[PDB]
């Protein structure tokens, strides 16, 4: 297959719905079609979606922005049905403006392969970190597929976010990992709080699981 | 010594060029050139440079038969894909602006961006001169262009625009 | 495939040495000037490089290599010094063809930045992967700058090799952070074997430190 790329015009870049979004039914999944390099003299930018070639209409486009390089900027945000996302349907935007000598066309939808569910494990400190002041409380999420996944930590009520995450590993087995780092305060550990590590992906039951870690 | 001036004029009036452009000097019949005070053409009433190239830069003068030597003209030949062009650096308020941004061997260039003191000025999906009707002296700065080459992202070196009062 | 325009012309990428490779005097370290989007109809390539602004002459260019897009790509070598690199040279290609303007220069060095020790924590499996037949013996490494590091593992002294090492995280101060995670067989784990995480970076002491696992 050869690369036939587009010249001189605008330029489309159409983004899926966040992980977590998806995932969690009383959230709201949104794709986004972003039209960037419009110019002052054909300012008008149009918007059709579809989904599986099916054309929708409860998109809503923004008004145009223009930005620090003196570039318009649009926005197209359409609101997508949860099942309708994981099912695998196709979402397409199409973009119409008079310099492009015909519209642009941009396609994306969810992740495809054999699903994998994590195995989601949590690991105390080191021994020999309880000789510091802050103390690293570990997540390690493994065996998963596709890679679109969220994972956060929590600490007794409330979100804890002193949190880092590695980007998800490719695994010899052709899986993922990744590992996820809270760093607390070595009193908070040495005095009983339960950390919680929760992790959202689309093969584990309810599209959720959380392990629990304390001294 | 008792006669008139004669005078340098260049087409195009780019006094800085990039290399690979042609230049044509002038003079305002038994007319000799003269390039860094080394005689250059005997005779010859315009001088052509055909593809420009570093060593061609620096000061011309010229006289005629019936006129004393000429004011010099210092033309400057710079090296690299994008060169940004203007009739003159130091304009009044209200004089017309015209910009030009220059590519090497005049390769299309899209998607081209004028800037003014980092900022974006005007954007053009392809290619076309910026012209300011009217200037304020809100167009005093240093100036660059830019754009695409192909997927190659290009950008001239900076120039500075005075606006006088 | 149909041969595409290059209005541009080339376009040249430099790329550092590997971290292990400068830290082991037993390897060999090397910067890669690459060349790509040259033209059938421009092809000659010239390479100069430098050392803090020296030429140098003992770079080794590999022949064009055709690509599947109808461009040539080509490659040179240079083989830089451990300690050079490490004490902040600059390596400096420059890359010569008809189709540009000028030369195009690139220039690398290591990363600037305060380098800070590696703290190195080895972590054993969670109670509840001793269900399952294939264990997770961890390796964090944290607290360490330059993010250039390098992570292997042992079983009683000899190199296991199913493990991977996450890329390095920026954390909250700056410095970096990774995990190194090897997957064994329980029985391995369960019969008392000893494992090693292996860590290499500048900033330790003999750019080396092991630190070991094992059950009681
Ligand atoms: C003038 O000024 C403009 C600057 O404003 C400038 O516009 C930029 O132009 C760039 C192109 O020149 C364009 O570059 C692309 O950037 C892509 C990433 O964009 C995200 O990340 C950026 C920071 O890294 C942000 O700045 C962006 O805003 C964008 O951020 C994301 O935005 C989405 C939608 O808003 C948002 O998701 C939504 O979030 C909401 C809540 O906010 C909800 O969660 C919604 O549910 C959800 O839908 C994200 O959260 C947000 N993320 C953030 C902020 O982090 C980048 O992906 C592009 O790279 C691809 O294409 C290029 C081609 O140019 C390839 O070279 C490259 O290989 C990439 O390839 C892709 O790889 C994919 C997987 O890896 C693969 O699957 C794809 O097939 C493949 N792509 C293709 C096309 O084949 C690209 O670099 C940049 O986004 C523009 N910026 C903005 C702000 O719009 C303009 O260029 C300037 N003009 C001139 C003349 O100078
Ligand atoms: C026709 O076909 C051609 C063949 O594919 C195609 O060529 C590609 O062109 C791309 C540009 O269009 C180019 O993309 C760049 O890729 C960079 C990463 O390249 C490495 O990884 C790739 C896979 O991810 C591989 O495909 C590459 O070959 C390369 O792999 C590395 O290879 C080296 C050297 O051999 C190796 O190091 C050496 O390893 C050996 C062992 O063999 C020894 O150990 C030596 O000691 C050691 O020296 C590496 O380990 C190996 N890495 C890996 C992972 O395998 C990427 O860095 C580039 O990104 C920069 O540029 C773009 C602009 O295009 C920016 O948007 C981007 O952010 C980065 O640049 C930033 O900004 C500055 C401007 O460049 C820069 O100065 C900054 O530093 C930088 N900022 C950062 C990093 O934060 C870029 O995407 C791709 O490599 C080419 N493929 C090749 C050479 O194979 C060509 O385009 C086609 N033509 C068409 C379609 O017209
Ligand atoms: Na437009
Ligand atoms: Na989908
Ligand atoms: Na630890
Ligand atoms: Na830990
Ligand atoms: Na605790
Ligand atoms: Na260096
Ligand atoms: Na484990
Ligand atoms: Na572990
Ligand atoms: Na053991």
Redesign the pocket.
């Given at each position: 297959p050869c690369?036939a790329?587009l010249l001189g015009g605008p330029s489309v870049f159409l983004f899926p719905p966040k992980p977590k979004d998806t995932l969690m039914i009383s959230r709201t999944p949104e794709v986004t079609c972003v039209v960037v390099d419009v110019s002052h003299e054909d300012p008008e930018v149009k918007f059709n979606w579809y989904v599986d070639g099916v054309e929708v209409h409860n998109a809503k486009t923004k008004p145009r922005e223009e930005q620090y390089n003196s570039t318009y900027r649009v926005v197209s945000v359409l609101t997508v049905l949860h099942q309708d996302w994981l099912n695998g349907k196709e979402y397409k935007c199409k973009v119409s403006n008079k310099a492009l000598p015909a519209p642009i066309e941009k396609t994306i939808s969810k992740a495809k392969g054999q699903p994998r569910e994590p195995q989601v494990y949590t690991l105390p400190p080191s021994r020999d970190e309880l000789t510091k002041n802050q103390v690293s409380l570990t997540c390690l999420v493994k065996g998963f597929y596709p890679s679109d996944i969220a994972v956060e930590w929590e600490s007794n009520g409330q979100p804890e976010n002193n949190y880092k995450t590695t980007p998800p590993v490719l695994d010899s087995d052709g899986s993922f990992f990744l590992y996820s780092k809270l760093t607390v305060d070595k009193s908070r550990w040495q005095q009983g709080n339960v950390f919680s590590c929760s992790v959202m992906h689309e093969a584990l039951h309810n599209h959720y699981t959380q392990k629990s870690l304390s001294l | 010594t008792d006669l008139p001036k004669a005078v340098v004029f260049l087409e195009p009036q780019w006094y800085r060029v990039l290399e690979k452009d042609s230049v044509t000097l002038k003079c305002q019949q038994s007319t000799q050139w003269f390039h860094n005070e080394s005689l250059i053409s005997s005779q010859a009433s315009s001088y052509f440079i055909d593809a420009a190239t570093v060593d061609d830069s620096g000061e011309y003068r010229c006289q005629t038969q019936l006129s004393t030597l000429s004011d010099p003209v210092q033309l400057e030949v710079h090296i690299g894909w994008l060169l940004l062009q203007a009739p003159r650096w130091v304009f009044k308020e209200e004089d017309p602006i015209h910009l030009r941004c220059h590519s090497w061997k005049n390769t299309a260039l899209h998607k081209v961006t004028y800037l003014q003191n980092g900022k974006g000025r005007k954007y053009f999906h392809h290619n076309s001169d910026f012209y300011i009707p009217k200037a304020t002296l809100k167009d005093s700065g240093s100036y660059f262009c830019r754009g695409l080459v192909?997927?190659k992202?290009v950008s001239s070196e900076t120039v500075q625009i005075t606006i006088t009062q």
């Open positions: 690369p790329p | 192909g997927s992202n």
